[PDB]
Amino acid sequence: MQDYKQSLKYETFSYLPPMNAERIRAQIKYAIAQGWSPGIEHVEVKNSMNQYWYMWKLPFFGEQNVDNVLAEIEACRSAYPTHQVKLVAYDNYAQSLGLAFVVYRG
Amino acid sequence: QDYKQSLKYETFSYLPPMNAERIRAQIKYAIAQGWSPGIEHVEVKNSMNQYWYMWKLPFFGEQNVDNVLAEIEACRSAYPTHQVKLVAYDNYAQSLGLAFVVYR
Amino acid sequence: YRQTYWMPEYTPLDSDILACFKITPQPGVDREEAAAAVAAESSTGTWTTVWTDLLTDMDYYKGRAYRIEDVPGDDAAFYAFIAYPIDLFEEGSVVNVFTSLVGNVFGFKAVRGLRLEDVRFPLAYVKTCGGPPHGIQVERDKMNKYGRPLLGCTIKPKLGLSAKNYGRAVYECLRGGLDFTKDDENINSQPFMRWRDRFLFVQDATETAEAQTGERKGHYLNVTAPTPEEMYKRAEFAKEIGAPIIMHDYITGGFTANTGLAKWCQDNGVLLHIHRAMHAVIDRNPNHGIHFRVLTKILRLSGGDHLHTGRASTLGWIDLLRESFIPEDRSRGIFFDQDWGSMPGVFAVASGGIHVWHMPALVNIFGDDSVLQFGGGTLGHPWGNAAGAAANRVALEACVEARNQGRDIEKEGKEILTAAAQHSPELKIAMETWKESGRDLARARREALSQQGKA
Amino acid sequence: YRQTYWMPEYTPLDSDILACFKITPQPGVDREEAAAAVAAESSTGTWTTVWTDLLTDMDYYKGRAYRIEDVPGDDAAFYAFIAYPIDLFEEGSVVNVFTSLVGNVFGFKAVRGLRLEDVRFPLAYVKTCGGPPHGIQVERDKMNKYGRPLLGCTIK
Amino acid sequence: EYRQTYWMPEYTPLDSDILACFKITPQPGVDREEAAAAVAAESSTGTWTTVWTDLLTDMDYYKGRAYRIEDVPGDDAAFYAFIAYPIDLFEEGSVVNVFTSLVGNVFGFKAVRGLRLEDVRFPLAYVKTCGGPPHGIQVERDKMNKYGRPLLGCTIKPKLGLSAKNYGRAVYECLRGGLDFTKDDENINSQPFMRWRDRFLFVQDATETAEAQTGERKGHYLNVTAPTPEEMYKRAEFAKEIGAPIIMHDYITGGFTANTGLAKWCQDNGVLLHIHRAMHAVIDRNPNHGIHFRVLTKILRLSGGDHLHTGRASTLGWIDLLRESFIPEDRSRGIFFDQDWGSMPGVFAVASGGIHVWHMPALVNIFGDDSVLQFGGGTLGHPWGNAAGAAANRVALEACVEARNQGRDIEKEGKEILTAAAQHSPELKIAMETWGRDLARARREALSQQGKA
Amino acid sequence: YRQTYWMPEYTPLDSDILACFKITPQPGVDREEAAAAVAAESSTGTWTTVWTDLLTDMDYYKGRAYRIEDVPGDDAAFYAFIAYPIDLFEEGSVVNVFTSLVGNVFGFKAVRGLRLEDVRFPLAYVKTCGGPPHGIQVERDKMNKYGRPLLGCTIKPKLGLSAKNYGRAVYECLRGGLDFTKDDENINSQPFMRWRDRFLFVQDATETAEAQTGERKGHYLNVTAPTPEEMYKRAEFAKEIGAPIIMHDYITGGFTANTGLAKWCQDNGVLLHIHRAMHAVIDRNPNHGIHFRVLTKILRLSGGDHLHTGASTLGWIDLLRESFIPEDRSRGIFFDQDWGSMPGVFAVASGGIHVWHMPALVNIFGDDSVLQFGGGTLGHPWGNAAGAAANRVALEACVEARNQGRDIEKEGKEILTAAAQHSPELKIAMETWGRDLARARREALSQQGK
């Protein structure tokens, strides 16, 4: 037997290894391919269970270029290097997020 | 003589800490009653929690005292700052026949 | 029966409730007369026309058979389609609609078998019912959960466990990565585990695993009870203690109780998980009884936030459960257009003897807005409930990350799971343990009606 | 299913709830194993024995098939008689007894048909339920009606 | 005359019948069959007479009837009558009605010199109608987080004259010393010198302060015995309002109606219920006329409590009656019927009354783990304070339990064990200077495999 | 014990509770150590002294044995008189006074037997208790009944009767001339007769019989219950349906419950008949237990409008009924008992009495009593109504005789036979089978006080 080591988690994909630029890219084009609007959020670690994270700028409505989203992630992380950074994708049909995951765990 | 207050840990924590011979006896007594030994651990600030972390699973049908004592020391090594508790599950009563903190 | 209750030229009004009965008639009866009988027996049930009828408008206040079809691949049975004016029923009462449709006619001796296949609830009647207390999107927002199906465990053994030991299993599961644990449908308040003690220790477990994971946890506390007063007392205690979700057995507890409980859940912000116990008594026999898709619709109207959904028919009632509009589709047993409007949809719940090796086919059949409930597939892990939960949770995510990447996750199943175990020892050990458009149509039609209206 | 849930030597206790299921089994299953399955599916429903079971007294907390009979004039079906200890249920809850007996097992694929024929409610469980609010004799006294069946009309 | 209707030696009791055993000391002229029959009639259908209204009913069903007579070992003046009562004679879930019916008339019967109710057989079908303990042993242990040892309590003295805050100070000192519980005396209600609401605030304050300083759940049996049900419940609600885990009631002097109601309230509210048996010696001391305490024991379990004070042979008889799931007949211990409790939980046996460190080995050896050990002067009387006496007792209890678990004979080896522990404990060392379940588990296994057989 | 608790020079205060205990000690005990032990065991629980005692006024908070007397006879028993300051007890709580006196001392190993004979309730404590909900005089005004004992019939069999058959026996009795019928002690809510159905038909019986006699009618509907909530629910339903009187088993249902029922009865204008079920467990052994006169005072404080009272007998009847009862050792009354304005309680006679007992019962109990005929009513050969009339005729002729000056007990057979020449029901029935002291004290006190 092997003992289960316990640690904080951060919802979808957090039970998998952190994502390289390649894996992040594929999630973003998945969202764009779904018609969802990419969005970026950040918050202090201790506050990650908050319903309302700081919004980085505005959602990227009509955004087709993955790379522009990937750069805005970098810029958000560079502005707040101690914060967790989240990617979300808005689904205006369902008034929900199609997808959301923590890009950097801070 | 004035009384010196300190935090305590339920059954046996008013006695001197147990060496290996004494721990084994409690383990042997629990097996002799037909209870299932179990091992839990938790951060010290959290000792009053109802739910500690389970170390592995309870040791059902276990007759080897020395294997439960090993897993205690195994659990201590993995969590040197945690309190370690030995418990003994009584299936008939749906209770614990025994519970005490092995390492504080 | 025929001359008054067979109306082949009647076109259903949009306010009408429509039913589809599969009738297997006795050898010496014609299809016209049997349809008209089922319509009469499920609405006026008149065996002799008397003077009090002449005090009423008999042409309005009656069910009417208006179409008959063959059952493909069965010359002995036929489909009878029946319209009921919206005025025959009490508003906001699945109890009354149910009783009216199925309360009398299944004992009709002149038929060999009777099976209610589908019911068309018109929008104007949908608007009179409370619906899910929350629904998929509200719940996701309340629990702050997006982009993946949710994951649950059903605690076993159903019997014999003290309140505290039961909370221990719950704690080990939740802390390893499941969102939800679940009371069995039989778990109410038995001698070995009184409900008040169960609620206290489960909530303790829920809070401890939530603090240790940073993700919201829940456990469907079963409030199925002998009496409405006991049901509501149990629900109130779950709210009092902070519990986000409760459970009801809506068939066996019954629709009156379930409808009231869903009303109470919306008024109190408690999520409501619905178990379908007893359904196979009603819905397994393909010749006699009520099809599960009817029981699906009744539950959406009555109210629930999750519903256990357990091939083509299966995918059909999931749509009926989750989507805003579902077109007619005989290949998936959907006999009428069903419009739900703004009435929210319900999480579909998959349970029953599934483990990690089912995960690709489950993410692929059910999609995101579903709960994947592992009974023995979580507890049976040779390392405990936490490792079993983590394995299921890793397998779930890797299948979601594969699919978002475009991969054929069901075909490439054993490969996605194998690349995943290379980082989760817990998922690897579990793999040696066990062997081996509905949305888009609904959106396409809302946009169509948004620009053109009636077109 | 059979080795734990078929107990042909068990004699029902008077506190036990008893059920009689008419089982029509699928062609390739024996009657012993099908009775034991119906007992398991209507009480513990276990598909894999796990560690939490070992925290409980598994011999007590389970339904048990204890007798099988033929269905007179039907060689395809048989009667399975099952005992459930009174502790499996919430007192004074037909809801709980009903759900327990019939909430899971009628979907058992390994059977062609399942029919619950009779249920033995032991006195010690009858005493926990409220019963008729009045009953025949109280009602007759309240309505001052004796010596004849009562007569009613259903308005149409 | 009663004999013809009420003496039925051919009757074998139904399993649903309430059975009673009376020790009857008849007057010199009366023979045993007629005494047994009168007792049976005067405790069911209270007459020998046949009036016309009786013929309206089934006189044969609706009666108690005596069905067996026995000698009393070593007492020719007295004999046992065993009497059966159809379950239908009694209101369900009401020990008040079974009590009244059994003992509310017959004890004045002039044709008997002495009448003593020895035992009552409650059938499983009637037990399932009563609420029982609000929690019982195993549930209370879970809530409090205490396993593997008897629980430890102290009763605050003086019972009279202490203000609320002074009282809480003796409570605080005891609890912080290692005792699990403290206790209002039976007479502590709401007297002018310590009004009940003030006592509850300061006791709870002491309870929280000692729990903070020890890391072990603490409680204090707050007495809600009151002039009226309204006052009883108000006091109970306030103890819950402030967070007290355990309350207390004098079930005999407050009464069976109030106590059943209190137990119900407790189970509905998660508050443990410690039961005091005040007045019982008025009833159960005289071995020729009254009600034996073992009957009072069974009525409490059915009415509801989580603890009961239980005080050789009979004493551990009624302890088994109080805690175990099934108790077989045993006349060597005064148990005259098998008593089946089913799933109704057992109640802690509480030992109190003039006990100190030296009684610990015998107490652990006799009561076992599932007991509370209440120390009056044995904690207050320590010469370093309450905290040290509490600690002394706690150490001596734990040493006995570790010694017992290790295979020692704690009674035969009492002095050595306490001395060896005295070495690591100045409090215990100076304190030393100043002063059954197997059966129920076996029957459950056998009935699991064989059932009725 | 004797050092602290034997206080022979202590003269009790008018505000003290006093208890008189008949102690039967083991052979080698001095009477004063036993008396001091009983004072201590019924007040402080101990003889020792721990450090917490010194935080308190030990001189005030303790019971005092202040006198010891011989028992005429049992030279192995003595009376111990004990005083308790009013402050040891919660006000308005017979439960707390009772618990304090008898909750502990009766297990004392050092005596062979302990018997609580009497308790002096000071007027300052009486005034804190609710007392009878109505009492003798208010009840006579409510029922409009003066000049005679009231008549009652306990319905039998206690068992097996439907509500409606039960109501039948009630109706036939009440219409015959009895004032009251009575639920039995054991009648609560059994399967053969649920309480709600019984209450309805009894009340039907009561109104039918009242309208056919023009006399107010009652039936003691027994609300003794498993819980206070059920007790109160049953009492509320009797009020909702118009029933004028209910019943409670005050010892077996209990003092907390009964004190609460009494106060609800006064708040709601419902008369309250009290049954002393199980008193004999407690009060029959002359060497160990609590005498029924203690139980009688407990009930008047707690609250009752009737009470079953079976030399000693006429003592506790005075205690139950009069405003002041002077000490009278010849009646086992060991203390003056002052009740002040607290109303008195109807004395209830029952148990196997019939017409032949009537002259004596009117003679012994007087007018302010209820005389309850079980089989004496139902057992009449011509049915319940005829036997009620027989009992009512006998009672009324015994009362007319007494008023006329005759010795009713000696001229008994003559009084009865003469009135049976006007009543067939009576004649066939024969063939089949304190105040002046209390008022003298009030006048004396009104004139010169002390």
All domains of chain B, ordered by start, with CATH?
A: 1-104 (3.30.190.10)
Instruction: Give C161's contacts in chain E (Cβ within 8 Å).
Output: none
Cβ neighbors of E109 (< 8 A, separation 6 or more) are: E38, E39, E42, E115
Same domain, F308 and F340: yes
Residue C339 near residue C449, CB atoms below 8 Å: no
Domain end position, chosen among F62, F94, F129: F129
Breaks (C-N over 2.5 A) in chain F follow: 310, 433
Determination approach: X-ray
Breaks (C-N over 2.5 A) in chain C follow: 310, 436
Q: What angle do CA C72, C73, C74 make, to 5 degrees?
A: 95
Indicate which residues of C carry an active-site annotation. 156, 275
Residue C216 near residue C145, CB atoms below 8 Å: yes
And the tokens for E343? 């799933």
- Which stretches of chain D sit within 8 Å of chain F by CB? 134, 137-138, 141-142
Query: How distant, in Å, are the alpha carbons of C142, C311, F425 from that of C275?
Result: 21, 20, 72
Judged by DSSP in three states, F90 sits in coil
And the tokens for E363? 């107490």
Nearest CA in chain B to C159: B94
Cα maximum dimension of chain E: 81
Task: Tell me if E445 is assigned to some domain.
Answer: no
Same domain, F67 and F136: no
Nearest CA in chain E to B16: E424
Q: Please tell me the distance in Å from D139's CA to the nearest CA on chain F.
A: 10
Annotated binding-site ranges of C? 104, 154, 158, 182, 184-185, 276, 308, 351
Nearest CA in chain B to D56: B91
Count of beta carbons in the 10 Å neighbourhood of residue C436: 9
Q: What's the reported resolution, in angstroms, to a tenth? A: 2.4
And the tokens for C140? 């996701």
Residue F108 near residue F80, CB atoms below 8 Å: no
In whole angstroms, give the CA distance from residue C105 to residue E41: 58
- Annotate chain D with DSSP letters as a single string: -HHHHB-TTPBPPTT-EEEEEEEEE-TT--HHHHHHHHHHHTTT--SS--TTGGGS-TTTSS-EEEEEEEETTEEEEEEEEEEE-GGGS-TT-HHHHHHHHHSSGGG-TTEEEEEEEEEE--HHHHTTS---SS-HHHHHHHHT--SS--------
Domain end position, chosen among C129, C155, C186: C129
Judged by DSSP in three states, A81 sits in coil
- Nearest Cα residue to E390 out of E366, E357, E364: E357
Same domain, C119 and C161: no
Q: How many domains does chain E have?
A: 2
Same domain, E113 and E176: no
Q: HEC profile for E324-368? A: CCEECCEHHHCECCCEECCCCCCCEEEECCCCCHHHHHHHHHHHC
Report CB contact under 8 Å: C46, D92.
no
DSSP A104: E
Cβ neighbors of C87 (< 8 A, separation 6 or more) are: C60, C61
In whole angstroms, give the CA distance from residue C40 to residue E251: 65
- Annotate C334-361 with DSSP letters as a single string: B-S-EE-TTPPP-EEEE-SS--GGGHHH
Residue F36 near residue F68, CB atoms below 8 Å: no
Chains in contact with B via at least 3 Cβ–Cβ pairs below 8 Å: A, C, D, E
In whole angstroms, give the CA distance from residue B38 to residue C42: 61
Q: Whole domain around residue E93: which residue ranges?
A: 4-130
Same domain, F409 and F272: yes
Q: Is D156 a catalytic residue?
A: yes
Task: Tell me if F443 is assigned to some domain.
Answer: no
And the tokens for E443? 């029957």
In whole angstroms, give the CA distance from residue E62 to residue E87: 10
- Which stretches of chain E sit within 8 Å of chain D by CB? 15-16, 87, 92, 123-126, 128-129, 342-343, 444-445, 447-453
Query: How distant, in Å, are the alpha carbons of D66, D83, F44, F205 from that of D87?
Result: 18, 12, 47, 45
Question: Which one of D82, D127, D129, D141 would you mutate to disrupt binding with E, by most E Cβ within 10 Å of its Cβ?
Answer: D127
Instruction: Give E99's contacts in chain F (Cβ within 8 Å).
Output: 252, 278
DSSP H/E element including C81: strand C74-84
Q: Count interface pairs B-D at CB distance under 8 A.
A: 16
In whole angstroms, give the CA distance from residue E433 to residue E445: 48
Judged by DSSP in three states, C280 sits in helix
Report CB contact under 8 Å: D141, F194.
no
Same domain, E80 and E149: no
* Dihedral-angle region of residue D145 (phi above 0 means left; psi in -120 to 50 means alpha; beta otherwise): beta
In whole angstroms, give the CA distance from residue F245 to residue D66: 57
> What b/e sequence results for F288-302 when a residue is b if at least 16 CB atoms lie within 10 Å of its CB, and e otherwise?
bbbbbbbbbbbbbbb
Task: Tell me if F445 is assigned to some domain.
Answer: no
- Annotate F294-310 with DSSP letters as a single string: HHHHHHHHH--SEEE--
Q: Please tell me the distance in Å from E148's CA to the nearest CA on chain B.
A: 4
Query: How distant, in Å, are the alpha carbons of A89, C9, F282 from that of F294?
Result: 83, 92, 11
Cβ neighbors of A69 (< 8 A, separation 6 or more) are: A28, A38, A40, A60, A63, A87
In whole angstroms, give the CA distance from residue E336 to residue E116: 13
Q: Count interface pairs D-E at CB distance under 8 A.
A: 54
Report CB contact under 8 Å: E343, C191.
yes
Same domain, F125 and F136: no
Domain end position, chosen among F102, F129, F156: F129
Residue F119 near residue F17, CB atoms below 8 Å: yes
Report CB contact under 8 Å: A3, B57.
no
Instruction: Give B8's contacts in chain E (Cβ within 8 Å).
Output: 178, 214-216
And the tokens for B57? 């699973």
* Dihedral-angle region of residue D115 (phi above 0 means left; psi in -120 to 50 means alpha; beta otherwise): beta
- Nearest Cα residue to C369 out of C275, C411, C306, C317: C306
Instruction: Give B77's contacts in chain A (Cβ within 8 Å).
Output: none
Judged by DSSP in three states, C74 sits in strand
> E159 a known binding residue?
yes
Same domain, E35 and E73: yes
CATH code of the domain in which E304 resides: 3.20.20.110
In whole angstroms, give the CA distance from residue E337 to residue E346: 18
Same domain, E121 and E152: no
CATH code of the domain in which D27 resides: 3.30.70.150
Chains E and D touch (3+ CB pairs under 8 A): yes
Same domain, E63 and E212: no
Task: Tell me if E448 is assigned to some domain.
Answer: no
Same domain, F38 and F185: no
- Nearest Cα residue to C424 out of A2, F161, F344: A2
Task: Tell me if E97 is assigned to some domain.
Answer: yes
Same domain, E124 and E143: no
Instruction: Examine residue C25 and say whether the peptide bond preceding it is cis (omega within 30 degrees of 0).
Output: no
| Helices F358-365 and F412-419: angle between axes, nearest 10 degrees | 120
> B41: which strand partners?
B53, B84
DSSP H/E element including E221: strand E219-223
Report CB contact under 8 Å: E395, B3.
no
